[PDB]
Amino acid sequence: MTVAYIAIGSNLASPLEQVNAALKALGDIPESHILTVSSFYRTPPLGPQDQPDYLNAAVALETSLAPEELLNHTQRIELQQGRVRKAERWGPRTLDLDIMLFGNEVINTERLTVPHYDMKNRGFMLWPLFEIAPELVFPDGEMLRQILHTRAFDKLNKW
Ligand SMILES: Nc1ncnc2c1ncn2[C@@H]1O[C@H](COP(=O)(O)OP(=O)(O)OP(=O)(O)O)[C@@H](O)[C@H]1O
Ligand SMILES: Nc1nc2[nH]c(SCc3ccc(Cl)cc3)nc2c(=O)[nH]1
Ligand SMILES: [Ca+2]
Ligand SMILES: [Ca+2]
Ligand SMILES: [Ca+2]
Ligand SMILES: [Ca+2]
Ligand code: NA
């Protein structure tokens, strides 16, 4: 087994219902078990700002799936919950499931880059992560607690 950490975001079509559906779906992924779910946070959109606020959360998922097999499940859940690709970069969505971490692995394939390329710069990923994994160390040996102590990250509000 390995523990994967998944970032959850929704800003369309009733985020709270999309996130609660998605946690039921994540549970139904084979060879995999939810271990912890963070609080839900209401976060102002980064990138384009002319969109609703996000519900952001994180989940620890223990799995013996291969990492791209986990990605096939998360992308399926997203598509099943009405995720459509528009041309706008970083536009709104009903659900986004980003694989943050897959144990201590570093993965660079055609479809999957882990760690998530920009997570150490995003408080809406790091704060929920720290709530479920305060002791987390990244594959490069960086400590999640150290990143949040040393870097300026706005405080997150609960949904
Ligand atoms: N760690 C990962 N988690 C999820 N998808 C990934 C990951 N690494 C690469 N991808 C690939 O990213 C593609 C584009 O995803 P998407 O449109 O959701 O980007 P985004 O989540 O909006 O932006 P960002 O990555 O900046 O948060 C997916 O089809 C998938 O192949
Ligand atoms: N709060 C919130 N804002 C979001 N923006 C996106 S698109 C990625 C992105 C694009 C540019 C920058 Cl600089 C940072 C993030 N996803 C979320 C999300 O889940 N939560
Ligand atoms: Ca399961
Ligand atoms: Ca826009
Ligand atoms: Ca995504
Ligand atoms: Ca994303
Ligand atoms: Na298998």
**Choice among 28, 42, 53, 83 that is catalytic:** 83
Assigned token pair, 84 = 């459509």
- Name, in order, each residue with C-beta under 8 angstroms of 122's C-beta and a sequence gap of 6 or more: 46
Angstrom distance (rounded) from CA 130 to CA 132: 5
What pairs with residue 157 in β-bridges?
42
Helix 15-27 vs helix 67-80: angle between axes, to the nearest 10 degrees? 140
CA distance 39 to 159: 8
Nearest to 61 by CA among 70, 49, 72, 52: 70
CA-nearest of 50, 46, 40, 49 to 19 is 40
- The residue whose CA has the least distance to atom 22 of ligand 1 is 90
The DSSP string of the chain is -EEEEEEEEE-SS-HHHHHHHHHHHHHTSTTEEEEEE---EEEPPSSS-SSPPEEEEEEEEEE-S-HHHHHHHHHHHHHHTT----SSTT---S-EEEEEEETT--EE-SS-EES-TTGGG-HHHHHHHHHH-TT-B-TTS-BHHHHHHHS--PPPEE-
89 is catalytic: no
Cα separation, 2 vs 32, in Å, equals 9
Degrees to nearest 5, angle at CA 95 with 2 and 63: 10
Site to substitute for ligand 2 among 83, 86, 90, most atoms within 8 A of C-beta: 90
Confirm if 128 and 100 have CB atoms less than 8 A apart: no
Resolved by: X-ray
CA distance 22 to 46: 22
Find the 71 Cα to ligand 7 centroid distance in Å: 14
Q: Which CATH class for the 1-159 domain?
A: alpha beta
> Could you tell me the distance, in angstroms and rounded to a whole number, from the CA of residue 101 to the centre of ligand 2?
17
